Design a protein that fits this description.
Chain H: Belongs to the peptidase T1A family. Chain H: It holds the Pfam family Proteasome_A_N. The structure is cut from a larger assembly and holds 8 protein chains of 8 kinds. Helices cover 27% and strands 30% of the residues of chain A. Chain A is an alpha+beta fold. Chain A has one domain: Glutamine Phosphoribosylpyrophosphate, subunit 1, domain 1 (4-Layer Sandwich). Chain A is globular. In chain B, strand 6 and strand 7 form a beta hairpin. Chain B has one domain: Glutamine Phosphoribosylpyrophosphate, subunit 1, domain 1 (4-Layer Sandwich). Chains in contact: A-C, A-F, B-D, B-E, B-G, B-H, C-E, C-F, C-G, D-H, E-F, E-G, F-H. The structure holds the ligand *[C@@](C)(CO)[C@](*)(O)[C@H](Cc1ccccc1)NC(=O)[C@H](Cc1ccc(OC)cc1)NC(=O)[C@H](C)NC(=O)CN1CCOCC1, magnesium ion and sodium ion (NA). Magnesium ion (MG) binds next to loops of chain C.
Chain lengths: 233, 240, 222, 250, 235, 231, 212, 244
């Protein structure tokens, strides 16, 4: 039985025609205190997978070490470690999903919500979620925390079902993700302006973008707002 | 824990430790079991090189496992106590779970199973003991006599003997015991048992023990004078 | 305090015919008032013409299905590729569930297939292993809505023969696969209307001696 | 891996001898001579400090050891075996007695515990017996002064006076002539030094001889004052200077 | 001495090979498999005439559809039978069905090599496991202390095994009736047995799909012995 | 001689005699053959019987849908090792959703057999195995020896008179390796290979045992009337 | 549940309902609450369905192992005590079982044993177990005599379950009858309350509280 | 491995004897003789100390005779160290029985349990047996005065008069000659000393080479008293019987 201390907020993601996009802000909250501002919550595994993690940061750092160790262990006695027998997103996910459910069953969970985004060896897009309860699900769009409430509605307007994926380009998909991150900065009290974004394409590969900022924000209309009702001045 | 496999096969297919345990049984004092029409009698030799004994307190050769079953033995005396104790515990455990006392076959099967376990367990030697287990099943008047041995095999006997010079008394019983007509009464059964021991014993004084078991938990041990009367009667008929 | 259980919603339904059996379930996955997936299947082909679904807490449901699939695999290894009968699978599942009697799998389980006489069979389980064979069973969040409808339309309950003064019951009879699928689709559309955890899509798995076939139908997405 | 020796390494031979115990006693015979003498008002235990090398500092190696404030021990045989026995003997005095009764054990009972440890090395799995004989001198309120010998078998005997090791046969004969039941402590120390000179060959002084007594209480050696009932240790190790003083009037 | 799990230079386990010699000293046991059933028969071999021969239990029930006959150090078989019975009943509990005869035999044979320095030595007893299931029908298995088991159409184990096996080689065909098999076991037992064969020193049993595993009475076996003697004199 | 009492003892020339005696048990075992192309891998096994009344000892065991082996030597030891493989293959599936690589399968068997050759009390495994499989890097064939040594090969054979089949495959190497997209022809080559190890006996219907795995073929075993095609 | 079993002149009658509940939700109406352990032994179920189902099937396996080992059918006393000793090991853990082990043997005769999850084991002639036990007792006790005929005893057992099925909200579905004699148990059919009620009301003239 | 060095202490000879038990008995036959004699009104325990040295402290010494509880004592023959292990077990077993039943332990029960421990060392564990033979002298309200003996085999028997250790053959013949059933304690005291005096390997039997003890009902009314004799008391009893 735990209680989360230093936490990370929403992780959002979606599929597009050739691959997947995933994003998450760089904040490490300590309750209401916005304590740490240089936290990377997107962790690449190889050149074909990115794991986005929210929840407890100490448990996130533990998972980082497991994934780091997984790459090492896979390389052992494996001449095709950088080829046919390289780590797939589906392998990495199933490992984590096994761990998460084992820990909840021992009543000592890893207090996290995880999204594994990647591209398989056959070109298929991989996007699947897992959390502290060991609950797993997949969808064209996936998001954690506040992202589930605010991002998914926006991302589902772009890709509402499976047939909408081939019709969605990387330019359109990234635009929707960046818009969603802005909306979360407006409305999530444990979010930050700075964030990271990752694209895993079946042609261009892994593109990891750091130090992004939310921009083109609408604040001007605030100047006209007075009191809470009757106040004219 | 001490793990050594002491009981093992030899090239000719024998487990010597089990066979040497049989030699210890052959050294032990003679014990005989004869079952009649309505009873079983257990006879036991007691070696007479020991005078100045205290027969009140000296461990008796025949032991009660329950009120309806008895166990005599031949071989190592110290080893027999361990088997008797285990058997007595299992007897009470059976009454507790099945709500019925053990059958003589079941009790024998348990004791035999213990003996067998010590022939293929690491760190232990076999029991240097063969037992005669006799009694009557609950609510049954059919007499029961069983034998066990170090190897773990057990079987039922109309009459049987174990211990030193047992082959001589078995020879006697084989011609004197009629399957078609077993000893009809208690007296006949005790006499045949005493007769068989008199082939081997020496004197019929404080060398022979006799225990009679009858149906419904009716077990009694004979005293010196009672046994001596059979000895006196047999010898007078012999001179003919 | 940490709560190890959750409710992922949805609902499932199994009906048995004379020479077939269906096991249906909606494809919606939820937590609280949010939708996680509009298409997340929870009715699986487990081999040996057995289909299975464990509805309730998805993590427990996936774990159970995963264990049973693995149970089928080892049954082949250990017993010379023998086919696992539906009655034997049911008993095996009871032991899987009851093994966690004091920390249960929070799922209502249903399996379907054919019995050893070739006839359609549906077995249903409670969360701790009690099971029963039936012609009909609904499980999950909307089971209370659907089940009485099936009692009426599959087992003809409370239906009497017209003009017989309520003395002669409507006779029992097997249904065609076409009639059964009509009942399944109507059952799920009705359930989708009045239960918020039910919707998005409907996936049916039909089992005949020829194998396992699938059918998919859209459901309301609100 | 793991200790697979779970069986006895000391067993009975056809003649009835316990070989390893006999051989352990042979090792004690080879060892340097040590002795003990009981007086009316004290006990003395003494031994030769056989130096392994003149570069070695023989002060750092203590053959005579304090076990409790009123009990001391000396040995003949294998030094390492003795050292670990002293460690175990000191600890058992606390664990099996002082931590229970709030006072130190009497000599006979501590001796009994040491004997138990040595007996177990004679019967337990995968071990040889200890290659030492101990002489344990001590005092307690209800038994007074006492002197005990402990052999590799675990057997122990009380003595008025005795010697063990190299020249024990001659030393025991010497002690029989000199010992009486009216000996004062100083007279016993004198006899101890006389007896030991016979077995020692090289130098005979306070630096080559190790000698301790169980006598009167020593308040100066207690380390604190304020508790009337605590009067100090009866065990005292004689200094190199204190030995040489008595060697002049020898 | 030497290790219990040691290999010989020829590539065999000493203890397993020595246990096979113990089995050769054991009393004869024969099994014959037909399309109408599987017959099991044994030599009782009482060591003395005072011993009540009906207490000699060398044929044993494992389940209603599986029987077993033994030869060698028969005391060692008790724990093997106990395991087999539990395995059979346990499988029925887990799977609501009868367990395959092969699967049962395989479970018993898993005990065989669980010895070393687990139990201290191999078993000194061989088993003939006969049974029926829906998949492979009537089956006869020979289970050794090596952990190996062979299926047989017919098989003899014990002291008269090599002589009886050569006889079974000639006599067995795929169209034997149950009655023909019963007589054949009695015939071959009488040949290899020391003492003269009768109902008291030999025991028959069979397993059929309909009636399951049945040990024959001394009255029933006696008539088959009398039927056998008459048929041999008739030509 | 004096250095063959247990596996923990080296000889003066640096030999482990108990391991060599375990190796000897394989030579006494019935012949079995393994060979592969680029699309399929095939096991062919000559089964052995006690006599005419007995069944023929089953030589081939399935480990997963994509992997399995044939045995030669102590059959119970093969059962232990095959069971270990089944678990390892299964662990890879449940935990990583990943079919176990045939190369890793060999590495795991090597390490399991090794531990038995360095510790007191235990003994070496008394069986040799031929593992075939199809994974993400195509078809594979492995040869396991109870010394621990595992070897990847195009083709091989173990058991009594295995040198005859091994020589044939060494000649036929260039031919059978290019039998791609043709199961029946690759089996024929294997059946012809095992025939070089036959003496006095010939391949009958309940004597021959064939197994195959490939690109669009799960590991399946053929016995009885199913192998009559290849005689 | 409502289950009963009583001893009488002609052996033992055993009658049970067939309802399963999950709170106020009727989970089933066609459940088997009698387990046929062997041709001479029966077991009734009441309480947690899984506990009853699982452990009484397990009990049957233990009874089978007994007759294999001992070459003799297990006694009703020994069979009941295996189950009672088992649940006593789990005492406090939360098992919920109300059971009746009914059967015949030569040494015992017709015998009934009540066994529950808190370790109580009682021999007796009449028992009613379950949520509707009181309703069944009311009818059964007021009509019970030792000298009942097999025909009358079968009916009384059927009528007692019906009475409880009616009043008890957590009992109903159908009545499963059994009769245990010296020759073993005999099944006397499944009787749906949907038809049985109106048939009994009309023929018997009872149930005047209900609108006819 | 270690198999090479295993003596195999718990195995049978081809003749069916336990090697180690037989060799332990051979060891005990060289130990100082101990005699037990049971009278109608008490029990005597007499034991000869092993070749004494003149500088041995005699009064504060215990080698042969030990107290198990207020009603039971033992005479030892063999390894003293081994005996003390068994004695402390026996002392604890007696207190366990008293704690459980609020009654002093019956003599036979204590004897059986101690003998069962010895038995265990001959059948399992791979350890050497205890090289000890006991003479148990005790009293309880069931059988009254009782003498027992146990040996390394774990076999125990009851006696009227018995010897263990050295020269038992000669000692048992002398006891068998002069013993009778109506004997008193003071007569048994004399018999015990006379027997040792003749069977001793020493030149002459003296007070300093003996341990002596009696268990009488010679206390005040229906209660038992254990008397472990002091040196001066042995000196007096030796003069009183006319041995010195
Ligand atoms: C009547 C109907 C009263 O309920 C009977 O007792 C009936 C008996 C019965 C026996 C065998 C098969 C079916 C029915 N009992 C029930 O129907 C039973 C009631 C009950 C539930 C829980 C209990 O405590 C654990 C005790 C009694 N119903 C069930 O078992 C239902 C089907 N299942 C569950 O409630 C599932 N729960 C059980 C407890 O553990 C968590 C899951
Ligand atoms: Mg809806
Ligand atoms: Na209820």
């Amino acid at each position: 039985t735990q209680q989360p201390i230093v936490t990370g907020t929403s992780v959002i993601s979606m599929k597009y025609d050739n691959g997947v996009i995933i994003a998450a802000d760089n904040l490490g909250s300590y309750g209401s205190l916005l304590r740490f501002n240089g936290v990377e919550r997107l962790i690449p595994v190889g050149d074909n997978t990115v794991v986005g993690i929210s929840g407890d940061i100490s448990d996130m750092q533990h998972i980082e070490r497991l994934l780091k160790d997984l790459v090492t262990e896979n390389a052992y006695d494996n001449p095709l470690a950088d080829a046919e027998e390289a780590l797939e997103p589906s392998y990495i996910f199933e490992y984590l999903a096994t761990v998460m459910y084992q820990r909840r069953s021992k009543m000592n969970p890893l207090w996290n919500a995880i999204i594994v985004a990647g591209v398989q060896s056959n070109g298929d897009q991989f996007l699947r979620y897992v959390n502290l309860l060991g609950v797993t699900y997949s969808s064209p769009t996936l998001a954690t925390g506040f992202g589930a409430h605010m991002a998914n509605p926006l991302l589902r307007k772009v890709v509402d079902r499976e047939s909408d994926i081939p019709k969605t380009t990387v330019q359109v998909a990234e635009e929707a993700i960046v818009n969603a991150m802005r909306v979360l900065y407006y409305r999530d009290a444990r979010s930050s302006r700075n964030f990271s974004l990752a694209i895993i394409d079946k042609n261009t590969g892994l593109t990891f973008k750091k130090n992004l900022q939310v921009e083109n924000m609408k604040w001007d209309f605030a100047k006209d707002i007075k009191g809470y009702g009757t106040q004219k001045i | 824990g001490y793990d050594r496999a002491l009981s093992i096969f030899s090239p000719d297919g024998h487990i010597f430790q089990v066979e040497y345990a049989l030699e210890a049984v052959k050294r032990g004092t003679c014990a005989v079991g004869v079952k009649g029409k309505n009873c079983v009698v257990l006879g036991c030799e007691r070696r007479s090189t020991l005078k100045l004994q205290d027969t009140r307190i000296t461990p008796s050769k025949v032991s009660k496992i329950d009120s309806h079953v008895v166990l005599s033995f031949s071989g190592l005396n110290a080893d027999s106590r361990i088997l008797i104790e285990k058997a007595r515990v299992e007897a009470q455990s059976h009454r507790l779970t099945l709500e019925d006392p053990v059958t003589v076959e079941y009790l024998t099967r348990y004791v035999a199973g213990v003996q067998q376990r010590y022939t293929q367990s690491g760190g232990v030697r076999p029991f240097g003991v063969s037992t005669l287990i006799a009694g009557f099943d609950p609510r049954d008047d059919e007499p029961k006599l069983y034998q066990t041995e170090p190897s773990g095999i057990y079987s039922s006997w109309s009459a049987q003997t174990i211990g030193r010079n047992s082959k001589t008394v078995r020879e006697f019983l084989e011609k004197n015991y009629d399957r078609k007509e077993p000893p009809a009464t208690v007296e006949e059964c005790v006499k045949l048992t005493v007769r068989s021991l008199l082939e081997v014993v020496q004197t019929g004084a404080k060398n022979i023990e006799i225990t009679v078991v009858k149906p419904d938990s009716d077990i009694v041990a004979l005293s010196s004078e009672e046994i001596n009367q059979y000895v006196t009667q047999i010898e007078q008929e012999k001179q003919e | 305090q940490f709560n190890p259980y959750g409710d992922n919603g949805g609902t499932i339904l199994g009906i048995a015919g004379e020479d077939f059996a269906v096991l249906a379930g909606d494809t919606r996955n939820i937590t609280d008032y949010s939708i996680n997936s509009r298409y997340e299947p929870k009715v699986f082909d487990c081999g040996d013409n057995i289909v299975m679904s464990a509805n309730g807490f998805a993590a427990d449901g996936d774990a159970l299905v995963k264990r049973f699939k693995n149970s089928v695999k080892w049954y082949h290894f250990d017993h010379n590729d023998k086919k696992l009968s539906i009655n034997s699978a049911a008993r095996n599942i009871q032991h899987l569930l009851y093994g966690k009697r004091f920390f249960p799998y929070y799922v209502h389980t249903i399996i379907a297939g054919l019995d050893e006489d070739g006839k359609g069979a549906v077995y249903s389980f409670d969360p701790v292993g009690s099971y029963e064979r039936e012609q009909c069973r609904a499980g999950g969040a909307a089971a209370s809505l659907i089940m009485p409808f099936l009692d009426n339309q599959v087992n003809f309950k409370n239906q009497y023969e017209p003009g017989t003064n309520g003395k002669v019951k409507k006779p029992l009879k097997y249904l065609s696969v076409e009639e059964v699928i009509k009942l399944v689709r109507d059952s799920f559309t009705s359930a989708t209307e009045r239960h918020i955890q039910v919707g998005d899509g409907l996936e049916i798995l039909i089992v005949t001696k020829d194998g396992v076939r699938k059918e998919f139908y859209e459901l309301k997405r609100d | 891996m793991t200790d697979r020796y779970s069986f006895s390494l000391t067993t009975f031979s056809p003649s009835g001898k316990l070989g390893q115990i006999d051989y352990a006693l042979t090792a004690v015979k080879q060892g340097v001579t040590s002795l003990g003498i009981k007086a009316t008002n004290g006990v003395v235990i003494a031994t030769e400090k056989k130096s392994s090398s003149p570069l070695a500092m023989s002060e750092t190696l203590s053959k005579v050891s304090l076990l409790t404030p009123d009990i001391g021990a000396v040995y003949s045989g294998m030094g390492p075996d003795y050292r670990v026995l002293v460690d175990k003997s000191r600890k058992v005095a606390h664990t099996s007695y002082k931590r229970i009764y709030g006072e130190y054990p009497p000599t006979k009972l501590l001796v009994s515990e040491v004997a138990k440890i040595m007996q177990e090395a004679t019967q337990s799995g995968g071990v040889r017996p200890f290659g030492v004989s101990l002489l344990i001198a001590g005092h307690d309120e209800f038994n007074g002064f006492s002197l005990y010998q402990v052999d590799p078998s675990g057997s122990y005997f009380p003595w008025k006076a005795t010697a063990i090791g190299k020249g024990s046969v001659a030393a025991k004969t010497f002690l029989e002539k000199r010992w009486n039941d009216e000996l004062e402590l100083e007279d016993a120390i004198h006899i101890a030094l006389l007896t030991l000179k016979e077995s020692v060959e090289g130098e005979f002084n306070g630096d080559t001889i190790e000698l301790a007594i169980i006598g009167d209480e020593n308040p100066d050696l207690l380390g604190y004052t304020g508790i009337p009932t605590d009067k100090g240790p009866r065990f005292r190790k004689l200094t190199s200077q204190e030995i040489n003083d008595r060697l002049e009037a020898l | 001495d030497r290790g219990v799990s040691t290999f010989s230079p020829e590539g065999r386990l000493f203890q397993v090979e020595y246990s096979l010699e113990a089995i050769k000293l054991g009393s004869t046991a024969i099994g014959i498999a037909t399309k109408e059933g599987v017959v099991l028969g044994v030599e009782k071999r009482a060591t003395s005439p005072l011993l009540e021969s009906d207490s000699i239990e060398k044929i044993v029930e494992i389940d209603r559809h599986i029987g077993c006959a033994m030869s060698g150090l028969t005391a060692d078989a008790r724990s093997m039978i106990e395991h087999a019975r539990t395995a059979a009943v346990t499988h029925n509990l887990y799977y609501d069905e009868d367990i395959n005869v092969e699967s049962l035999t395989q479970s018993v044979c898993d005990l065989a090599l669980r010895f070393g320095e687990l139990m201290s030595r191999p078993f000194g007893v061989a088993l003939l496991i006969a049974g029926h299931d829906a998949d492979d029908g009537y089956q006869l298995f020979h289970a050794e202390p090596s952990g190996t088991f062979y299926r047989y159409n017919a098989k003899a184990i014990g002291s008269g095994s090599e002589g009886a096996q050569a006889e079974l080689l000639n006599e067995w065909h795929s169209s034997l009736t149950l009655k023909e098999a019963e007589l054949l076991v009695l015939k071959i037992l009488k040949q290899v047995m020391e003492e003269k064969l009768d109902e008291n020193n030999a025991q028959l049993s069979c397993i059929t799909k309909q009636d399951g595993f049945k040990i024959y009475d001394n009255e029933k076996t006696a008539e088959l012995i009398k039927e056998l003697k008459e048929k041999e004199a008739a030509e | 001689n004096n250095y063959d009492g247990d596996t923990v003892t080296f000889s003066p020339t640096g030999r482990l005699f108990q391991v060599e005696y375990a190796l000897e048990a394989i030579k006494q075992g019935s012949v079995t053959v393994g060979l592969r192309s680029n699309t399929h891998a095939v096991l062919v096994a000559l089964k052995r019987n006690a006599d005419e009344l007995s069944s023929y000892q089953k030589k081939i065991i399935k480990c997963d849908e994509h992997m399995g082996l044939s045995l030669a030597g102590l059959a119970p030891d093969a059962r232990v090792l095959s069971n270990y493989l089944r678990q390892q293959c299964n662990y890879s599936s449940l935990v990583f959703n990943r079919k176990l690589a045939v190369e890793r399968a060999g590495h795991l068997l090597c390490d399991k057999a090794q531990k038995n050759t360095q510790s007191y009390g235990g003994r070496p495994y008394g069986v040799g195995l031929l593992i075939i499989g199809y994974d993400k890097s195509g078809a594979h064939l492995l040869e396991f020896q109870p010394s621990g040594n595992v070897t990847e090969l195009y083709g091989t054979a173990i058991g009594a008179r295995s040198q005859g089949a091994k020589t044939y495959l060494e000649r036929t190497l260039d031919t059978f390796i290019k039998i791609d997209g043709n199961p029946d022809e690759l089996i024929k080559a294997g059946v012809e290979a095992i025939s070089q190890s036959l003496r006095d006996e010939s391949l009958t219907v309940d004597n021959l045992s064939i197994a195959i795995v490939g690109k669009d073929t799960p590991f399946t075993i053929y016995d009885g009337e199913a192998v009559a095609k290849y005689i | 549940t409502t289950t009963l079993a009583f001893r009488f002149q002609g052996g033992i009658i055993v009658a049970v309902d067939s309802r399963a509940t999950a709170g106020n939700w009727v989970a089933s109406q066609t459940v088997k609450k009698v387990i046929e352990i062997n041709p001479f032994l029966l077991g009734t179920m009441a309480g947690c369905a899984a506990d009853c189902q699982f452990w009484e099937t397990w009990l049957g396996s233990q009874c089978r192992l007994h007759e294999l080992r001992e070459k003799e059918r297990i006694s009703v006393a020994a069979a009941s005590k295996i189950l009672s000793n088992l649940v006593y090991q789990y005492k406090g853990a939360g098992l919920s079982m109300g059971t009746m082990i009914c059967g015949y043997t030569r040494k015992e005769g017709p015998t009934i044993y009540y066994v529950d999850s808190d370790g109580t084991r009682l021999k007796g002639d009449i028992f009613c177990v379950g949520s509707g036990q009181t309703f069944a007792y009311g009818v059964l006790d007021s009509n019970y005599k030792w000298d009942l005929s097999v025909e009358d005893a079968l009916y009384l057992g059927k009528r007692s379950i019906l009475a409880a099925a009616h009043r008890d909200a957590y009992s109903g579905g159908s009545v499963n009858l059994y009769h245990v004699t010296e020759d073993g148990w005999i099944y006397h059919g499944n009787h749906d309350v949907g038809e049985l009620f109106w048939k009994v009301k009309e023929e018997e003239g009872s149930f005047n509280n209900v609108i006819g | 491995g270690s198999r090479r060095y295993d003596s195999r202490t718990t195995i049978f000879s081809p003749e069916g004897r336990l090697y180690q038990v037989e060799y332990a008995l051979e060891s005990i036959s060289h130990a100082g003789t101990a005699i037990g004699i049971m009278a109608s009104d008490g029990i005597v325990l007499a034991a000869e100390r092993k070749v004494t040295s003149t500088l041995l402290e005699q009064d504060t010494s215990t080698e042969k005779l030990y107290k198990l509880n207020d009603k039971i004592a033992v005479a030892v023959a063999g390894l003293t160290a081994d005996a003390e292990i068994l004695i402390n077990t026996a002392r604890i077993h007696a207190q366990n029985y008293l704690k459980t039943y609020n009654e002093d332990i019956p003599v036979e029960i204590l004897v059986r349990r101690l003998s069962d421990i010895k038995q265990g060392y001959t059948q399992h564990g791979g350890l050497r047996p205890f090289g000890v033979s006991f003479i148990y002298a005790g009293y309880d309200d069931r059988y009254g005065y009782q003498l027992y003996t146990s040996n390394p085999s774990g076999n125990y028997t009851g006696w009227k008069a018995i010897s263990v250790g050295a020269n038992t053959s000669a000692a048992q013949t002398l006891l068998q000659m002069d013993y009778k059933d109506d004997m008193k304690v003071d007569d048994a005291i004399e018999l015990a000393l006379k027997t040792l005096s003749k069977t001793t390997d020493s030149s002459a039997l003296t007070y300093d080479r003996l341990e002596f003890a009696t268990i009488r009902k010679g206390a005040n009314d229906g209660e038992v008293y254990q008397k472990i004799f002091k040196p001066q008391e042995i000196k007096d009893i030796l003069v009183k019987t006319g041995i010195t």
